[PDB]
Amino acid sequence: QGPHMWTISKEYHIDEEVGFALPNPQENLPDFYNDWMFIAKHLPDLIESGQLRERVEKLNMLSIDHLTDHKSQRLARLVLGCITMAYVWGKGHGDVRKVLPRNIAVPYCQLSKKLELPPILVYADCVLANWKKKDPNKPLTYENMDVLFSFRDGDCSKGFFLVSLLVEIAAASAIKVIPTVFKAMQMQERDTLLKALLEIASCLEKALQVFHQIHDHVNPKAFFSVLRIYLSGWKGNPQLSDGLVYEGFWEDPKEFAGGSAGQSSVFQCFDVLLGIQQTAGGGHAAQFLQDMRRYMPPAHRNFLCSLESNPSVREFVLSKGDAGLREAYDACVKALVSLRSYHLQIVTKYILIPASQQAKGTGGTDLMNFLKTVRSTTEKSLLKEG
Ligand code: HEM
Ligand SMILES: COc1cc(F)c(-n2cc([C@H](O)c3c(C4CC4)ncc4cncn34)nn2)cc1F
């Protein structure tokens, strides 16, 4: 019949409440994995004391066969991924391990192959599956939430991961409007389309207000001098120029990029929907965002290329000579420009200024240039405002 997004199929694994985030993540693994759980839950103490690497090297190789459902496999990825970052970087002062012991590398790679995700911590692990409600009968607010794992005391990982998650959830409230958009275009329902675009804009405007909470829960000194170390990967990294050896799984060292919000499917989703061709051309920013799709869960990666197969919303609006429809489309693009402009100020506070008192991103190239290119591509998609 063809690529028609008239409904969001349950096979895309997009939750009605939390969107691309993992709904009600599992907190405990079966008892068989207690040795992994003790290490993952005590990374601040084990790293600070210099005992982390020895505790990891003492592990027996545990089979992944006892992780029988999706949520336990996602929790185990988050546990193994946090342990791997702590093992590779240690205290973060130049003494790096270039070989991941087989006792963790083998189950980590087996589980990563099973979930079609690389054997490195991704945004879907440390943001989308790394959370819980303190009280299940209370709403999804910062006060009623916590992360499952942190790297070091005072690293601000709770604030950084949770505010990223909250923004991600706020933007997700617009996903349910996508089938209304495609259906209104197919059925030539102008008023329905206009109303749907304004609702998407409203959601993206609310996501910016949610972002303001970053200042209360993250401090620049801790983010840049402490958390930054554990967010780093091994692709174009001079500290691990050939990548990491996953002992017992692969013969040669392998390179994988560190976790990135370029792996967020909700932001890539609205750029695709609005025809902001962030992945077009052969430039660095476009190549990076396309590359980050292979670091997203497979159903979410599938949702994005499915959106790309649908008719263009931008081309539909551009061809109508309808001021009301063009304004509603621009309200969506404007809300993304506003988010990106505010995020540039956040990056200046949390990265640029601390770095100046001491910038390359996950892609190995200047992060300010990447962000400004992404923002500029969005601003240039406005049909009028200039
Ligand atoms: C302490 C605050 C923050 C800092 C320092 C920060 C830093 C960065 C950096 C360095 C990048 C470039 C990509 C990379 O190198 O991995 C990036 C991209 C991005 N960030 Fe953040 N970020 C912050 C907060 C947030 C929050 C709360 C969100 C909400 C989900 C967010 C969403 C994004 C998105 C979607 C991108 C991809 C580029 C774009 O779509 O404009 N960031 N961020
Ligand atoms: C030179 O100094 C630095 C360079 C940097 F690249 C970073 N860095 C990288 C990320 C990453 O993209 C990220 C993540 C990941 C954990 C998955 N999660 C949420 C998020 C929101 N926006 C970005 N997010 N955030 N900061 C930090 C640095 F200090």
UniProtKB/Swiss-Prot annotation:
Keyword field: Cytoplasm, Dioxygenase, Heme, Immunity, Iron, Metal-binding, Oxidoreductase, Tryptophan catabolism
Enzyme class: oxidoreductase
Residues the entry annotates as binding heme b: H343
GO CC field: cytoplasm; cytosol; smooth muscle contractile fiber; stereocilium bundle
Compartments, as annotated in UniProt: Cytoplasm, Cytosol
Highest taxon in the source lineage: Eukaryota
Enzyme Commission identifier(s): 1.13.11.52
MF terms in GO: electron transfer activity; heme binding; indoleamine 2,3-dioxygenase activity; metal ion binding; tryptophan 2,3-dioxygenase activity
Needed cofactors: heme b
Subunit annotation: Monomer.
Protein's job: Catalyzes the first and rate limiting step of the catabolism of the essential amino acid tryptophan along the kynurenine pathway. Involved in the peripheral immune tolerance, contributing to maintain homeostasis by preventing autoimmunity or immunopathology that would result from uncontrolled and overreacting immune responses. Tryptophan shortage inhibits T lymphocytes division and accumulation of tryptophan catabolites induces T-cell apoptosis and differentiation of regulatory T-cells. Acts as a suppressor of anti-tumor immunity.
PANTHER family hit by this protein: INDOLEAMINE 2,3-DIOXYGENASE, INDOLEAMINE 2,3-DIOXYGENASE 1
Official protein name in the record: Indoleamine 2,3-dioxygenase 1
Species: Homo sapiens
Organism lineage: Eukaryota, Metazoa, Chordata, Craniata, Vertebrata
Gene expressing this chain: IDO1
